[PDB]
Symmetry: D2
Subunit: 120 residues, 4 copies
Amino acid sequence: DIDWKQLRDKATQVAAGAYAPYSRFPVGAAALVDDGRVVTGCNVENVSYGLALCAECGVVCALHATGGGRLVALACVDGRGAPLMPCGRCRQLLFEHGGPELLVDHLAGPRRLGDLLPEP
Amino acid sequence: IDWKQLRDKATQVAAGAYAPYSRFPVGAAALVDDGRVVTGCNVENVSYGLALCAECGVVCALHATGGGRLVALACVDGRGAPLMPCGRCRQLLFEHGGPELLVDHLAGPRRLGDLLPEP
Amino acid sequence: IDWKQLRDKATQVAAGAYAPYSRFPVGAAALVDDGRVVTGCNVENVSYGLALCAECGVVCALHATGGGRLVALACVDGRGAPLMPCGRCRQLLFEHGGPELLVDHLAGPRRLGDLLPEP
Amino acid sequence: PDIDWKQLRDKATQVAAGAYAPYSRFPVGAAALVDDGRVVTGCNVENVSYGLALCAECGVVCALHATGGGRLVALACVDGRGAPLMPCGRCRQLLFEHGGPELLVDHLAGPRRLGDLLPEP
Ligand SMILES: [Zn+2]
Ligand SMILES: [Zn+2]
Ligand SMILES: [Zn+2]
Ligand SMILES: [Zn+2]
């Protein structure tokens, strides 16, 4: 059963590792895997902008580097801990590993990935 | 640099590879200038252009575990052979490793500065 | 909005598709707000993460031909059936078309705003 | 074809004026000679999600295939002031697929082979 406060705290903590000197907008993310472990990532920008990696990219990389599984929940936050909605690219990434019932943290209550990326 | 340890770690992480479209798993391990080792494996996607290389995982893990500069990288395929990073990954690595980063290669490691001239 | 013309131009351009890795060719055509039509096809790469969707070609062509906003898009597969853009491409299109951009679909076109909510 | 470097730079310079780069403010234009003689062009297109940015060379490669394919023979990439630029690593890998090691890239001293810009690809 999803501990949203754990996920947000983890996403806020990992945001400190963000490499975002171009945007000056650090982002952290934390996701609950179906075995119950949490994987994290932070954004990593590049001088060639189109090589930039979103925090959710880090999450999916760590998912598999730590043995795989399915994503159940995700929190993405700015430096100040405000929830953020994944970009379109990240919605497609996350859909591969979590499907439509993956929950994404949002101030009003979580959103299902299926609603954030219809007709996947 | 402990090349055997980096190769061992890259081989270990390659078992987690998510590569059902290419069926070409890859594992990568890098030494950070503070002594720690960070790892990644490739993660493909039905939209091919969203695929992440093992090296993208290494760079993500570098920063999620507190940043630093990369000193040495070993990438390995499923046969156990060293793999040269693709161009995208060379550019990625250059940002965090510069030209003196060493990449595992048969016979002896190569400098990233030679792999990506005029960066 | 001549959906027939957009679909035929998308089918035409799809014959130029470079998709030897997936064997899944895609063509796309978009009406720009000044009435002209810009096109693209998919272009894959041995490094899968470097693959370009047809819609990336549309967006590149939009700007290389002087810019504008996108009004309507048709994407087609090998059978000439409409395809929904991947999420990356939805974000791409949103930058240049916003929520009212129409995307061809069986039975009737869909708004980008519904395909990519909370943009 | 005989490579007309002047044509390729002029064409890259022209297309650079259409670059969509409101996040970096670093516009880039590119023009490539295809093996059938035609020139294809591209400019960079950035995105609010930085990692969705497309390089001028991505435009070049999309245009190549939208216009019937072939192999790239020469490329000129220019900044907003018309000065030559070297493609980024991603773009070297892209271009390698469509031009191989003998693709020439414009550079102030004289062109460079992609083979030298991307060894052991
Ligand atoms: Zn994203
Ligand atoms: Zn790579
Ligand atoms: Zn796409
Ligand atoms: Zn590039």
